[PDB]
Amino acid sequence: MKIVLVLYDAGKHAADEEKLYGCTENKLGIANWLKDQGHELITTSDKEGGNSVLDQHIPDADIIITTPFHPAYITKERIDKAKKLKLVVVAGVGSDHIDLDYINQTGKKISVLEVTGSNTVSVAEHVLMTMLVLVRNFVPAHEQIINHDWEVAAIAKDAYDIEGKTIATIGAGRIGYRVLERLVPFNPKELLYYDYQALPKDAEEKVGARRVENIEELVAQADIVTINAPLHAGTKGLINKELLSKFKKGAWLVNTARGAICVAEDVAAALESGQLRGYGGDVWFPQPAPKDHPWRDMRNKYGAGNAMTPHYSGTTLDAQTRYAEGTKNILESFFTGKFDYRPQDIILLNGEY
C-alpha cells in the first residue's frame, strides 16, 4: 500500500534531536517499519498548490497521515481524487483540517482516527505554566536579567501568588480537568468550571470543583480564566469585547484550545485598557500567526502581561513519542485486518461516526 505522510520540514533541527519524530526528516520513526512490511512511504511537507507533491500522490494513496502542526487539508476535491483512500490518520490530536462531514456524506469506507489522549497532559502543563508565568509576572522579570537591569519593585508591583486565586475553566474535558487536577495543591480560593455536561461526582469532588451554569457568572468571579473547550458555534467568537467586559478587572486569561474562540482585537484592547492583567496561550487565528498579529505586540499598561508562544504545547518530544507510537498502533490495526482500534481514537469508522 502507498502511505503519504505530511509533516513540516524541521531542517537542521531534525539533525539536532532524533526524538523530533514529527517531521519529514525523521518520518515518525516508522519508515523502516513500513518498508519492513512492504509498504511505500511518501513523505512531504509540500501540501499547497495543484502540483503539490501531496496532490500528485493522492490518486493512488491507500493511507494519508497528517498532523495539526503542518495540516494537510483533506478537502472536498482531494477526497474526490483519492480513489484508493482507505484511512486518514492524525499523528496527534485535532481534525479541523479534515472535511469529516463530506467523507461521511460520500458513503466511502474511509476510516479517520487520531491518537486521542497523546496531547492532553502536554497542553495541561502548558496552561498551568502560563497561569504561573502571568500571575507571578515572570516574563518582565526574566527580561530585566537578560537586559542587565535589576529593579525588583518594577516586577513586584504586579506579581502575585496563584494561591488564594479563583480559577475557572471553560470546558472540563480531558485537558481542562487535567488542569484542575494540577491546580489543587496550589491551594486556589476555589476551582470553577463551565461545560455542556457535568463532571462525574467523584471526579468533581477530587479537585473540589464547583460548576457554574452560565459563563457570565463564571468569568465575573474568576481571577484566572482558561479556555479548554472545543471550537464550535457556541464558542466561536466567544471571548469578544462584550464578554470581556464581565471579566473581573485585571483578570488573567489563558487559551490553549483554539484562537478563533477569541476575537483578537477585543482581547488585545482588553489587555491595553486593564480589563485583563495578562493573556497567554499558544493558539492563534489566523495560524500560523502573521507578523502583524496583534497578540504579538499587545501589552498591559506596565509593558507586560503577554505570555504568548507559537503553537507548540502539544508537540513536545514526549508528546511526539506518543504520537508516533499511536500512529503505528493505528496503522497496525489496519494492516492486519483486525481493525482493533482503541475506541477513543475513532473519528469515523469506515465513513460512519
Add this chain to the structure above:
Amino acid sequence: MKIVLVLYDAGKHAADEEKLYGCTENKLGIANWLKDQGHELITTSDKEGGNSVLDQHIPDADIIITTPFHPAYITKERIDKAKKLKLVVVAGVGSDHIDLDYINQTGKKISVLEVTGSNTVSVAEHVLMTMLVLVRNFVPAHEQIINHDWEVAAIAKDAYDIEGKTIATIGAGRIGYRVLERLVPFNPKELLYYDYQALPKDAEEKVGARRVENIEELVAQADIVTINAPLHAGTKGLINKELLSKFKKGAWLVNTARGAICVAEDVAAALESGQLRGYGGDVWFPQPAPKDHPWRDMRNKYGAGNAMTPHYSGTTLDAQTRYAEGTKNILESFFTGKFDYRPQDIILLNGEYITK
C-alpha cells in the same frame, strides 16, 4: 519609641501599586498606626556607609525592621552602637543579614523575629513555574512571538513534559516539601529528596518521596534538581564543577534558595557544555547581581535554557501583605508588653535561642 525601618525605594512603582507595602514609600502600611501610638518612625533605603541614615539613628533606635530584599546588615559593629536596641524584625523570612551569633554569644538582651511561613508558598510556586518554563522551553518560544517569528521545530526540539521526569530536591524543609506537594499531580516518574534528616514517614508517603542518602547519587538519577536548603558549611559551593559532572546529562536545575550554594562560573560552564539543559531561579551571589554576572548572559547550545529572574519570588503582593501584617503583630506584641509572639517567629528571645 524610635523604630528604624529599612526598605528599598520603589519610586514610581509605589504610586502605581499601593499594595506594594514593602518599600520606603508605603512603609509596610503601618506608618499611621505607629504615629497614633506615639512612636517615631525613621524610614530609609540608605544603609551603606557610616554616614547612612541607618547609622545616624542606630545609637538610639529601640526597634529595627529589616527585609531580605534590601538587607540592612545588623553587624557586630552596629549592635555595639545600638545602645537602646531591644528588637530586630525581619519583615519577611531570612536572617543572614543579622549577626545572631554575636547577639547570642554575648548575651545581649535583643529579640530577633521573622514572619515565619509567609514566603514559603511564594517561593514554592516560583520553583514549579521555573521547572515548567525550563522543561517546556517557554523562554525561546515567547521570544519568537515578540520578535515576529514562527518556527515550531526550533522550540519543540528541546521541549519536554514534566510528566515522567525524576525530580530531586536538595533540602526538604518548608519550601522543599511544598514544591514536592505541588508536583504530585504532574505525575513525575518519582519525587526524590536529600536532607541531613529524614522526613516523617507520613510526610514522605503523602508525596511519594524517596530519600537518597548522598547528593552524588541523588543528582545522578534526577532529570530535574531543585535547591531548597539553607546556606551553611555543608551547602556553600555545593553545586560546583565536580558535583555537576555527576548530574544526569541534560538535567534541569532550579535554585531559589541562595546563590552562594552554587559556584556561578561552574553552573554556566555546565549549561554551555550541555551537562545542564537549563538553569533557573531568582537567587544570586553577589546580590544584587552586577551587570556582568555570568548567569545573566549564559545560555545552552540552543540559545535558551536561562530562566533567571531578579530576587523577587518571595516579595509578591500576596506575600508582602503577610509580611506587613506579620510585622504589625510582632510590634503589637512588643508595644503591649505581652510578648505573645508566635512561637515559630522567634529567632532569638532576649538574645537566647528558644525551643522550636
